Design a protein around this ligand. Structure first.
Ligand SMILES: [Zn+2]
Lengths: 48, 56, 338, 103, 495, 96, 49
DNA sequence: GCATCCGTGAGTAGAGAAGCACAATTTAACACTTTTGTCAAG
DNA sequence: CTTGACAAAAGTGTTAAATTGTGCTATACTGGGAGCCGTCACGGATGC
């Protein structure tokens, strides 16, 4: 929604943001027709 | 009067980088440093060792 | 002020010139126009090139920090004029100096404009310098008589210079502006169709939205043209040890096999031509170019042996027939053509 | 100090982290241990050299022993450059070959 | 004969031009449609050679016996296409650029010769500080300027152009001082502001004009208006006082009177000497004069101080802003002149004297300089060759642009590095031709130096140059030769 | 790579092995005749298919690339003879 | 994380289109260009280690 | 003497986001003789 | 062996459309952007 703070008018529409790759049942992706796995990454946890 | 000198000891890396032939020194490490000093001095590699002749 | 960051260094330098007030802007703009008119008045009287005086006047304003003999000679020639004429030289000097200060005080305008064109193939400093070229042209074409602010007119020239430079310098293989804007329009049209369709538009759908004179064939050809070249140093794999150039074979230099079969063909042809006569073999060698490398026309061949054009055709064709007979009996040249 | 790193620092003529202390001249060592610090004096005919060894220094020489120039007063890896200036080219070459062989 | 020795030495600008078969003037590589090399580009056949053996670009010649012939139409030599692996081009730089190897390879060879530190060399080469070549009798802070002295931008502007500052006034007030009043430090120009420098104070834009006719009349001056007469001028009835775009707004005098300017927009205090004149002027705005130089009255009026002349056509006076014609320059061009004027034989003698100094550190430092000095003397190399005037261009076959079997083109990073240099060098030539201000020229020259550095050694100084759409640094000439993936260890020591 | 029908990599350590063996001519073939001596590799193949022994090898093309790339760095690299006279390894193809 | 990066790039392009003006007939579809978000997502699933 | 930032180096294979106006230059479609190429005459 | 004869094949001079290069838009707009640091020891210089 686009809001005009001065006028006070709201314009609402659904915009197409693209395509989200979908994970298959077994837990992989098909990227450009090729099966791919996103490997989990380990790193230092945030904090103090 | 003869030149008075004292012996020096350097590691293999420093000894290899101070060789007369600039081709073998440049092909080892510090290529920018080796070529910079060789070009200014106008060094002439006499192709004594093996690496120089391999390159050519 | 930054030894490392050039952008920060440039911003510091342009920050040392204060922004012009409206009164200061009008005064400088008036001087540039009066100086330009004064140079025109000087040239009509002194008789030399109007642009020649501008270079000489600008050289004095720029100073020794920026041919030297002819500039000084023209400078003395201008000063030899009477009092009324030397007045025009005075406005010319002040007009050129006002132009220098007017450009310097608007270097903040170009940076604000240029930062909106980043990520289009040119670095930020490249955008600023191109915008500076547009700013310089804006000063020359600006008219203060119209009472408009300088930034209103200058923004048009700063945007144009940056836009032109992107269309001319952002691609390794340069594409003309008329085709760059075609590519930009096609990309915009495809983007707008995607949001309406919820998917990648087809070439027919893009062509229909472009308008008359556009079909799917033209859209595909334009998109093929817009393809940027790929780097030979693009890494392959997780380690920077394999690159695209390592997998591209050279197809220009003949291979050792190709070079060898060329030599074998030459030695077989030279033995096949040995069975011919002396002049008869030389005719084929000169006709086909086996000596010089170019086909020699019948008239050129005829001049060498002192014969008419149709004479060669008799000996050239009869030599051809006998080589066919020899080949059928020996079978030594068939495999060299497949 | 052990294995491949020991070989590398010998071939690179690198100064050891826990370098030993060698006598610069020959003479007779004279130990003076106190509750505060340690100081070893190599007394000669007319020379009195000084070395301020730390408290936790494993000395390999006792009082009265005659030491040569370049001999290690304390245990540990000898700095090859110090040995060169103390005893000469032949000593350091002999030292380098033996130490590399030990590994 | 048999190859027995390989010699490496610096290449002079003359030697680089002797290598090149032509100057690469355009950043173009190939036509996008015909896929043929563009003229004067990085792949031009007239410079580097024909694409295919014994065939010119236009196609007039297609025979081997034309070997050694240059086509009159296309200008391409009829020879083997393999010359495109060997024939080099060159780029004629608008301004000299330093070779980054002789700048950043610690210790700097240029800095060692010139007795400049790494920081000092960086400031001069990349246009942060000026280095003095000829003081021309300049004095800074009471100390005369010396050769090789480093000047900041502010210090250079004070010496080159003078010292001045404008003091804005609060809206609606009047200045206490009058036009052309010799104010001093701390003297109040207006109730709310004081002059931070001593000099001559002059009104910039008088908002109100008071004419006392021979009865005062207060007018208003619009921001688009300009007063044509000075303060105290004798204006005859009807003469123009304040100019305007439209003649209706023109403020002409009703009768004869004296103009009194009031309500200045700001006061400009400039450290200048004013010489009133009555006759014509022998100089003009921008001229530089020394003490004793005649200014306007054919000898009667002469300058008594160093400065730059600005003639005033309304105040009828000549103001000489106290400044010096100091020759201080930035960039590699300043560094090149220092190495050109450096006498190696004299420097060697001076360094030998410093070798006798009892300090070990000074002897060690002098030995480092003498080793570089003796290297130039023994080899015959000329120290200013470390600054490039002509940039060699690698043969196109060693930086190929090839069409892959798929149809897309593949090219080396050097072409992008070369195009950036050509674009910046060509733009500097146009900026210089247009008489652009020094700030624009300085930025372009600094960009030119960085473009040269990226071509030779990308990432050595500053942020590495990357192609748009990726963070991958472009592979420079240094990167091609050095490292495990470099030419030595990947293609020469093993194959 | 097998997919590109490529040759085997004869790296520095393999070069070291031939040097330690004293196999100078075996080393020189791999450096020139079998890798990048364009004239040599063409003449080697032609000689072998004729039943002849391969000719004397010539300068590798990678050294020519090295010299040209060094010139691109504004470095004057020249091959000299016994008498210090310049020797052209480019067959007169790069001399104006 | 890569979705957020692309969305931040998309948000930046929305601001500049808001700076351009033409607010009389500005719609959210016109302000939003999804390509920066699609490119970041495509880059993650194709060229990420 | 010492402390610090910079620059150097760290195994080998293989296998993988502007638009328009107008001028200026180039391309391509024409016509044209011009020149081969040739097929019959002695 | 010449010498005519042909129909191309090739060269060539115009002319047109297609392509390419250049200039110009007048409310006012005047200092950026992305990073953002888990390795190690080694010289070598460069100044406190
Ligand atoms: Zn031609």
């Amino acid at each position: 929604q686009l809001i005009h703070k001065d006028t006070g008018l709201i314009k609402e529409d659904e915009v197409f943001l693209g395509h989200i790759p979908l994970m298959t049942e077994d837990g992989s992706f098909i990227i450009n027709g090729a099966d791919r796995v996103i490997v989990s990454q380990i790193h230092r946890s945030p904090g103090v | 009067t003869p030149v008075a000198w004292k012996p020096l000891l350097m590691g293999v890396t420093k000894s290899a980088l101070s060789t007369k032939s600039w081709l073998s020194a440049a092909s080892f490490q510090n290529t920018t440093h080796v070529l910079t000093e060789a070009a200014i001095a106008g060094k002439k590699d006499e192709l004594i060792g093996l690496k120089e002749n391999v390159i050519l | 002020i930054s030894t490392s960051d050039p952008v920060r260094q440039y911003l510091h330098e342009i920050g040392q010139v204060p922004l012009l007030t409206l009164e200061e802007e009008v005064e400088l703009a008036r001087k540039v126009e009066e100086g330009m008119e004064a140079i025109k008045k000087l040239s009509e009287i002194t008789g030399l090139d109007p642009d020649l005086i501008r270079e000489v006047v600008r050289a004095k304003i720029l100073g020794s920090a920026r041919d030297p003999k002819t500039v000084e000679e023209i400078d003395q020639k201008l000063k030899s004029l009477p009092k009324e004429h030397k007045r025009y030289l005075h406005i010319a000097r002040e007009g050129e100096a006002a132009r220098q200060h007017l450009i310097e005080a608007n270097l903040r305008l170009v940076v604000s404009i240029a930062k909106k064109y980043t990520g289009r193939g040119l670095s930020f400093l490249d955008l600023i310098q191109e915008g500076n070229q547009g700013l310089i042209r804006a000063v020359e074409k600006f008219e203060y008589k119209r009472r408009f602010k300088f930034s209103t007119y200058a923004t048009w020239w700063i945007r144009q210079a940056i836009n032109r430079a992107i269309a001319d310098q952002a691609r390794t293989i340069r594409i003309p502006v008329h085709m760059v804007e075609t590519i930009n329009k096609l990309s915009r049209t495809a983007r707008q169709l995607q949001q309406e369709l919820g998917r990648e538009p087809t070439y027919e759908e893009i062509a229909e939205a472009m308008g008359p004179g556009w079909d799917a064939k033209r859209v595909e050809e334009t998109l093929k043209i817009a393809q940027e070249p790929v780097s030979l140093e693009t890494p392959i794999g997780d380690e920077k040890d394999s690159f695209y150039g390592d997998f591209i074979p050279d197809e220009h230099l003949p291979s050792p096999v190709d070079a060898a079969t060329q030599s074998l063909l030459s030695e077989e042809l030279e033995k096949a031509l040995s069975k011919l006569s002396e002049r008869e073999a030389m005719v084929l060698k000169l006709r086909k170019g086996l000596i010089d490398g170019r086909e020699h026309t019948l008239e050129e061949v005829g001049a060498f042996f002192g014969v008419t054009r149709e004479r060669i055709r008799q000996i050239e064709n009869k030599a051809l027939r006998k080589l066919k007979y020899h080949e059928s009996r020996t079978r030594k040249l068939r495999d060299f053509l497949d | 100090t052990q294995g491949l790193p020991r070989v590398i620092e010998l071939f690179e003529a690198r100064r050891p982290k826990a370098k030993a202390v060698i006598s610069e001249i020959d003479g007779v060592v004279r130990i003076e241990e106190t509750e505060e610090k340690l100081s070893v004096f190599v007394e000669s005919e007319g020379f009195s050299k000084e070395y301020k060894l730390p408290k936790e220094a494993r000395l390999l020489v006792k009082d009265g022993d005659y030491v040569e120039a370049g001999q290690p007063l304390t245990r540990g890896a000898i700095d090859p450059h110090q040995l060169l200036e103390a005893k000469g080219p032949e000593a350091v070459e002999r030292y380098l070959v033996e130490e590399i062989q030990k590994v | 004969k048999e190859v027995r020795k390989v010699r490496i030495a610096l290449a002079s600008p003359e030697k680089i031009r002797s290598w090149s078969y032509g100057e690469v003037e355009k950043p173009e590589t190939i036509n996008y449609r015909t896929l043929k090399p563009e003229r004067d580009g990085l792949f031009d056949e007239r410079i580097f050679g024909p694409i295919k053996d014994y065939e010119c670009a236009c196609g007039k010649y297609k025979r081997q016996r034309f070997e050694g012939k240059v086509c009159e139409r296309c200008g391409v030599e009829v020879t083997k296409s393999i010359v495109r692996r060997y024939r080099m081009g060159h780029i004629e730089l608008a301004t000299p650029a330093a070779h980054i190897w002789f700048v950043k390879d610690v210790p700097s060879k240029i800095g060692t010769l010139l007795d400049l530190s790494a920081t000092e060399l960086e400031q001069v080469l990349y246009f942060s500080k000026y280095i003095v070549l000829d003081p021309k009798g300049a004095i800074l802070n009471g100390v005369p300027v010396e050769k090789r002295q480093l000047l900041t931008d502010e210090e250079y502007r004070e010496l080159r152009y003078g010292k001045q500052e404008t003091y804005p006034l609060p809206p609606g007030v009047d200045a206490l001082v009058k036009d052309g009043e010799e104010v001093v430090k701390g003297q109040e120009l207006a109730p709310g502001v004081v002059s931070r420098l001593d000099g001559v104070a002059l009104y910039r834009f008088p908002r109100r004009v008071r004419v006392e006719y021979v009865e005062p009349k207060d007018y208003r001056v619009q921001p688009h208006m300009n007063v044509v007469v000075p303060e105290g001028a004798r204006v005859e009835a009807g003469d123009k006082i304040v100019a305007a775009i439209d003649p209706e707004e023109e403020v002409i005098a009703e009768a004869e009177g004296v103009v009194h300017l009031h309500e200045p927009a700001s006061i400009l205090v400039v450290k200048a000497r004013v010489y009133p004149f009555e006759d014509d002027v022998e100089v003009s705005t921008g001229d530089r004069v020394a003490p004793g130089d005649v200014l306007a009255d054919g000898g009667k009026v002469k300058s008594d101080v160093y400065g730059r002349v600005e003639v005033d056509l309304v105040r009828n006076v000549v103001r000489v802003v106290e400044s010096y014609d100091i020759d201080a320059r930035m960039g590699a061009e300043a560094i090149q002149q220092l190495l050109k004027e450096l006498d190696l034989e004299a420097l060697e003698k001076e360094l030998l004297e410093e070798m006798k100094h009892p300090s070990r550190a000074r002897r060690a430092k002098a030995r480092k300089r003498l080793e570089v000095v003796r290297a130039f003397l023994d080899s015959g190399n000329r120290p200013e060759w470390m600054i490039l005037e002509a940039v060699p261009v690698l043969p196109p076959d060693l930086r190929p642009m090839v069409q892959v079997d798929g149809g897309r083109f593949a090219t080396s990073d050097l072409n992008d590095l070369y195009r950036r240099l050509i674009n910046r060098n060509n733009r500097l030539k146009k900026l210089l031709a247009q008489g652009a201000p020094e700030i624009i020229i300085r930025n372009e020259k600094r960009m030119l130096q960085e473009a040269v550095d990226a071509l030779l050694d990308n990432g050595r100084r500053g942020a590495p140059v990357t192609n748009p759409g990726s963070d991958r640094p472009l592979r420079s000439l240094t990167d091609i030769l050095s490292g495990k993936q470099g030419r030595f260890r990947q293609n020469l020591l093993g194959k | 790579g097998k997919a590109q029908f490529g040759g085997q990599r004869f790296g520095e350590m393999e070069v070291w092995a031939l040097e330690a063996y004293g196999a100078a001519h075996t080393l020189q073939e791999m450096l020139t005749l079998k890798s990048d001596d364009i004239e040599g590799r063409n003449a080697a193949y032609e000689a072998i298919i004729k039943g002849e022994d391969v000719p004397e090898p010539s300068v590798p093309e990678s050294f020519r690339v090295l010299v040209k790339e060094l010139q691109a760095l504004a470095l004057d690299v020249q091959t000299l003879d016994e008498k210090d006279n310049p020797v052209d390894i480019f067959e007169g193809l790069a001399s104006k | 994380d890569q979705f957020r990066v692309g969305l931040a790039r998309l948000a930046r392009g929305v601001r500049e289109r808001m700076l351009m003006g033409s607010e009389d007939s500005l719609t959210p579809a016109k302000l939003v260009n999804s390509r920066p978000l699609e490119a970041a997502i495509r880059e993650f699933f194709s060229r990420s280690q």
